[PDB]
């Protein structure tokens, strides 16, 4: 529940493989580039950035947050992170036809099927799917997500976050 510190090194262009977004006067991770320093320290879509090099991110724009990272002195950058504060987990069971009972598009839940496991569990729409049975699905094509769900056993555990 408490914030963790990460330490990362910037590449030649002052980059760490991170895009950030301003939400509700906080700063949140929006895109993590594959095999970047940011990926290595476990930063993920939805993680909140409290500080960059000890400076509070509160009220910063995303443009400002990126400028701070790019202009930071030295190679090493420290950030203080609160792990995905908006994340929740829902476990569903496939019915006799192998369905859990939702429709999604672009990795976002758009409808809940009547009287399904998703309905019983109170799955919400306008929520991004983050993980399915321990498989990160951020950045995957809908077909691969549908395939993960298809090959899943009966128990389907998803982590979701409001689309915010």
């Amino acid at each position: 529940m408490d914030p963790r510190e990460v330490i990362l090194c910037k590449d030649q262009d002052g980059k760490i493989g991170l895009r950030l977004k301003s939400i509700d006067n906080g700063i949140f991770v929006q895109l993590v580039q594959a095999n970047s320093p940011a990926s290595l320290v476990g930063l993920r879509f939805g993680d909140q950035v409290l500080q960059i090099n000890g400076e509070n991110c509160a009220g910063w724009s995303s443009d400002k947050a990126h400028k701070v990272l790019k202009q930071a002195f030295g190679e090493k950058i420290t950030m203080t992170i609160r792990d995905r504060p908006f994340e929740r987990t829902i476990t569903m069971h496939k019915d006799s036809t192998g369905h859990v009972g939702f429709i999604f598009k672009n990795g976002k839940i758009t409808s809940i099927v009547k009287d399904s496991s998703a309905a019983r569990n109170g799955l919400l729409t306008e929520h991004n799917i983050c993980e399915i049975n321990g498989q990160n699905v951020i950045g995957l094509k809908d077909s691969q997500i549908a395939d993960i769900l298809s090959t899943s056993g009966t128990v389907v555990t998803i982590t979701i976050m409001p689309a915010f």
Binding site: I103, K105, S143, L149
Partner: peptide, 5 residues
């Protein structure tokens, strides 16, 4: 294109 699951 959407996916009912």
């Amino acid at each position: 294109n959407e996916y009912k699951v």
